[PDB]
Symmetry: C3
Subunit: 307 residues, 3 copies
């Protein structure tokens, strides 16, 4: 099938970045146009990819079945409800009714997905030590944080905290075994771009947290940022190894973390906490997503995007 499921990282990153710029509109009015443009592009890409995945389900179902039952590849399916919710979050600025439908569909969908598949892993004998990949964060962590912030947008703050807690504790519970595995077992080049997902947890976490707690930059938020930056520095040092075999579209795996660096930066700035660091983070993350967009346009022009 021409669209790899991981390509949903593209509308993910663009949508999350739209939301970051939305949050600067009262500081700088021109930010709203930037936000609206990113949000429209993200939503358009999302519509296309959803329609493609619907085609995959109807006409390439055995491919979906295999990816679903894989103890590694199943995780990327979580990008579908994650991006559904982020597009709902964008659309809320124009039509809260349609936004709320998408947010609930994505929330119910992700929770059903993890409840069916993530739990099934605990039966043993399918997941192996070599299945311990960064992509596991998507259904386990990122999906819950996205529900948390989306439900908060709709006014469901206490429900949002339930999802937030599920994501935060799931993160802390998985990461220890992931990092140990990475230390011992060299992740093969074909999977290395997924190291970008390692950037996500702390930044997604703090972004979701600030979405639910009325943007109060408190001790927890600062603690999360600190570990987030540690991981950034580690991944920056590792970047040449990450791309040993060349630049590829899989690098959009970094975009959840990058866009969430941008979003959380707007809240730190608004709160007058570490404004200088905030400006750095916001500019850095925009530049890197900008480079992702330029490499993507390049690939599309050369006919090297779709399978």
């Amino acid at each position: 099938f021409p669209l790899p499921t991981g390509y949903f990282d593209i509308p993910l990153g663009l949508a999350a970045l739209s939301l970051a710029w939305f949050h600067l509109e009262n500081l700088f009015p021109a930010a709203r146009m930037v936000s609206d443009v990113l949000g429209i592009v993200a939503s358009a890409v999302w519509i296309l990819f959803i329609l493609m995945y619907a085609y995959k389900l109807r006409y390439y179902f055995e491919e979906v079945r295999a990816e679903y039952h894989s103890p590694v590849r199943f995780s990327f399916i979580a990008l579908i409800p994650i991006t559904t919710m982020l597009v709902g979050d964008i659309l809320y600025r124009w039509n809260p009714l349609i936004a709320e439908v998408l947010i609930w569909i994505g929330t119910i969908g992700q929770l059903l997905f993890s409840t069916l598949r993530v739990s099934e892993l605990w039966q043993g004998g399918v997941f192996e030590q070599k299945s311990t990949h960064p992509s596991f964060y998507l259904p386990a962590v990122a999906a819950n944080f996205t529900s948390a912030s989306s439900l908060a947008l709709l006014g469901y703050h206490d429900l949002g905290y339930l999802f937030f807690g599920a994501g935060m504790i799931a993160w802390i519970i998985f990461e220890p075994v992931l990092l140990q595995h990475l230390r011992i077992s060299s992740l093969e080049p074909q999977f290395r771009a997924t190291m970008g997902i390692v950037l996500a947890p702390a930044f997604v976490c703090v972004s979701a947290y600030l979405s639910i707690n009325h943007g109060e930059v408190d001790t927890l938020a600062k603690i999360l940022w600190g570990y987030g930056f540690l991981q950034l520095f580690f991944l920056l040092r590792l970047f040449p190894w990450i791309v040993e075999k060349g630049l590829n579209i899989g690098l959009w795996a970094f975009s959840a973390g990058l866009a969430s660096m941008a979003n959380s930066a707007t809240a730190f700035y608004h709160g007058n906490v570490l404004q200088g660091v905030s400006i750095f983070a916001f500019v850095f993350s925009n530049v890197m997503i900008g480079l992702l967009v330029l490499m993507t346009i390049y690939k599309l022009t050369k006919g090297q995007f779709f399978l």
Copy 2:
């Protein structure tokens, strides 16, 4: 010996459920009679099982020695001081002096037990990867949370927080390796009922926390509930696999988590946080413990309770 040590889960669940109903007496006065009945039954069962275990120690000591030195079976011994403290907590409503004696005996006992046995594991060569079982939560986590809430009942809030922290961090430190093990290694049917202990940590944690913090349903409490419900949903989906080889008395392993869902629900309700979810949780957990009681009466009638 006719009584398996794990049968202490029975008075555990009944006692904790008594405490949950106790907490509804000011909302609904009739809750006190329900609480008192459960508490008396729990205490009676506890007396019987303690006397049986005393008989085991005196006359079947090599069985106790073997269970103690086992890197898997040692954990169930922690049920003894846990239930001692919970019975003390019940009895506090009638006789705070006797209650305080039981609470200190259970606290000193559990701390000595873990200090002797849990630490010894760090010498290596005895505990194996296959020893990584949910039962490890009992001495490591549940016992500290029970001390925390019991000491808070007696007015020792800051000491309670020390025990609370020991339990909470011990939980977060063990669970990562447990879930990885479950993913890789299929837990054999003879141990699967112990999957019920996986329900316990977040719910016991929040119940203990709310016992020490004057029932303030805050961000931490909501975060814990969220992960607790995630685990519930996972265990509900796994339940047919859990009971693949049939229903058994080991299912009382679920009762710490179920009773703590009930207890924490009363505090969320009192705090006007997620009242609807609270009512669901309280009813659900009571119904499931009710089913445990019905299956137990059935087994006793058929002569299939004691070994």
Copy 3:
């Protein structure tokens, strides 16, 4: 080379203990003289060891290269910037300018060190399961906590919280796999003194936390102390096994945890939280570091200190 890198634990422990006594000066004025004496001795030892390590770098570089590339021995190098910062913290009482230079040198140095080496481990194939040692806490955890408290001393509280969060989450993320490894694999006698580093995380954590949060002994601080004491009790029970093959200078590995027990005790006492426990902790930790000093003087007199 005559000085093992681990000997930097000596000025570490003495320096941290100086800081603990400094914090009692307003309660008991004579504490300042004790603090100043420990601080001068710590600083003198530090100067000597730094000059020795400079000699090692210039004239024994291949030894440094090998220790740096080792997935186990690299960690002890982090003691160098850690102690640089602690000596800066001492010197702040006399010369804030020189203190600030040392604190930034140690902060930049430790962050560069971990960014280069800790991240490199994630490439796989070098670190092995048997590399999972307590010493990993030094670059990963202790160095960040030391930056946190040192930057707070200089007035950089929000930056301090970033370092604090990096250390705290790094701790929680490593400890699960460490304790599992210790359970399964018996740590060989030649490394067992490093079990003392297991005492460090919770106590260093709470000490750093209280340094940044204006000494407010809150729920987090109490939670940390509780797990800290759990680990102390475990290590006390394990102590005969730790020293199975005899007392050795490696036991200074305990001093980060002991000195941080002392420091945090002063803050709990100041806050009127668990004063009795605080007095116990402060006396205990001073006595144990005192014994370390006596065994060290003994070794120096017998010519058994330097390699």
